[PDB]
Structure formats: structure tokens, C-alpha cells
Amino acid sequence: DLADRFAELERRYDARLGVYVPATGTTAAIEYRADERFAFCSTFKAPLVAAVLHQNPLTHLDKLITYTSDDIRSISPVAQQHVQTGMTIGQLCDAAIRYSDGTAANLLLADLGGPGGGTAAFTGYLRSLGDTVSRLDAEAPELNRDPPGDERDTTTPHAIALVLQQLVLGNALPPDKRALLTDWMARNTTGAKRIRAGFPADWKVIDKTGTGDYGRANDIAVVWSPTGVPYVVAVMSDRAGGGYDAEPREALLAEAATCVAGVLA
Ligand SMILES: *C(=O)[C@](NC(=O)c1ccccc1)(OC)[C@@H]1N=C(C(=O)O)C(=C)CS1
């Protein structure tokens, strides 16, 4: 029944949709193509910032990172404007989450160490949380310039939602670090037309979005009902038949979020 509605959405948008909301004490898990792989795009930036927080002392946030104009490979609304000053690990965190800054992310990986510019260390951090499915192989970008059917740089709605659940609602991070991550996602500036648009205004929403080629659009959120009940919502889509230059349908993610809201309501 729910599946049928999701399918209609799939038809209505010429897209592939993947949805997952973890089960709770009173609601069954919601799932559509929950175990199929979808490109991370920038959604990794969120558990990345938790990788960075887990590993180091709070104090580490103040550490200044220096980079050059050639380090700027991808959309960098913030890092582009600070080549002269550089940014603390804290300002990098903030921008990788709230503005989806491609360079801020590229830096924070590095700051994680080891082969793959940091991607092994990052996939290392996912594993540590029980996620054996997801994998980040490449750096920003290219991460969103893979072919449909390529398993590098992918995750599932299932896998990312359980991760996000531990970060924000669970015990993955000490409380101090927990509120840093959560507060940064609550003030995300890139998601107003996604999960957040599909839910009544009186539900609180935090999230981190992802966008890529082949009409890739993702959104991962934690929502709070008017009464304070939290749920984790993972919504992912691509439109492979439109090819590389296919356009991401944001209204797909907003609608699927409305279907989800009605079922949680
Ligand atoms: C996230 O994926 C992001 N953008 C891209 O990767 C990207 C988008 C479009 C074309 C090429 C690459 O950086 C990885 C940032 N996040 C968003 C977002 O909506 O959350 C973007 C829309 C683009 S920048």
C-alpha cells in the first residue's frame, strides 16, 4: 500500500526512490528500496563531521587548517572565501554540514589520515558503527561523478539511517559532541525544499542533503513530532535514464516525506 504510493511517485518523476525510517517501540520500519545502493553525494559530510569529533578532543576544533586556491575542487561557498585566513576544524565542520562545502569536506577527510585521502579512515568509522554496507572511495568530487551501477561511494537508505540514528539519537558520540553535530544539522541551509518541505511545520527537522549527476537527490533527517517523538528519515533518488545531465527532482523527496509523515502521524 505504502509501496504502491512510492511507486506512483517513482512513475510521476521518472526516478528511482529509496526510503527508510527505522522501526521504533510503536511503529514498524518503513522501507522502499531500502537496501539498494545509492550515491552518497554530500550526505557523508554528516557522519564525516562525527568521525572528526569522535577521534579528537573538543580542543581539536580550534586547530587552524591552511589551504590554497587550488585545493578548491568543488562547490565551496565558504572555503572559497577564506583561503587567506584558513579555517578551524570547527569552521570546516560547520560549512561541510550547513552549506555542503566541497573543500571543507575534502580537508576533514585528510585530517583523518591514511590511504584514500581519508576515505578508508572514513569507511573505517562507518564500520565502527555497524555499517558494513557503505563505502567512501573517492574525494570531492568524482564522488558524484560515478556511473549508475558503480558501487564505489555508495550507501543505502537502510545503512545511513541506522548510522544517523546512532549519531543523533543514540550513544555514538558523548553528549557534548552530540549537540555540536545536531546543532549544525538543525541550521543546515540546503534542505528547505526536501524532507523539511514534506513535513508539517510543527515537526522539528534536522538534516543533511546530497545532490549529484544522473539526477541524484538525497536527504537524511531526524524529525520530532509536535509531541517530541523522534524518527530517522532517509530518502534517496536518482534518475539514471536521463543520463549524466538529468535534473534532480527535489519535489520527489518532499512528497515522499509527506507520505512518511502521514504514516507516522
Ligand atoms: C553534495 O553532493 C554537494 N554537491 C555535490 O556533490 C554536487 C552537486 C551537484 C553537482 C556536482 C556535485 O557536494 C558534494 C553539495 N551539497 C548539495 C546539497 O544539496 O546538499 C548540493 C546541492 C550541491 S553542493
Task: Give the CATH number for residue 84.
Answer: 3.40.710.10
CB 152 within 8 A of CB 14: no
Residue whose CA is closest, atom 22 of ligand 1? 211
* Cβ of 190 less than 6 Å from ligand 1: yes
Alpha-helix residue ranges (DSSP H) falling in the chain: 2-13, 45-55, 89-98, 102-110, 119-127, 157-168, 175-186, 250-264
Resolution in A: 2.8
Q: Measured in angstroms, how far is the CA atom of residue 235 from the centroid of ligand 1?
A: 15
Print the domain residue range for 15. 1-265
Distance of CA 227 from the midpoint of ligand 1 (Å): 33
**Domain total in the chain:** 1
The protein residue whose alpha carbon is closest to atom 10 in ligand 1 is: 212
User: Using CA atoms, how far apart are residues 120 and 138, in angstroms rounded to an integer?
Assistant: 10
- CA–CA distance, 135 with 73 (Å, rounded to integer): 21
Taken as a whole, the chain contains a residue count of 265
User: Which residues are tagged catalytic?
Assistant: 42, 142
The Cα 78–Cα 86 span in angstroms is 10
Q: Is the CB of 117 under 6 A from ligand 1?
A: no
Q: Are strands 64-65 and 87-88 parallel, antiparallel or unpaired?
A: antiparallel
228 Cα–ligand 1 center, Å: 31
Q: Would you give the distance in Å from CA 264 to the centre of its chain?
A: 22
Q: Does the beta carbon of 103 lie inside 6 Å of ligand 1? A: no
Neighbour count for residue 184 (Cβ, 10 Å): 20
Cα-based distances in Å from 27 to 1, 91, 203, 219: 16, 38, 17, 21
- Contact at 8 Å (CB) between 46 and 161? no
The single residue listed with the C-alpha cell 576544533 is 61
Of the candidates 139, 100, 142, which has an alpha carbon nearest to the alpha carbon of residue 118? Answer: 139
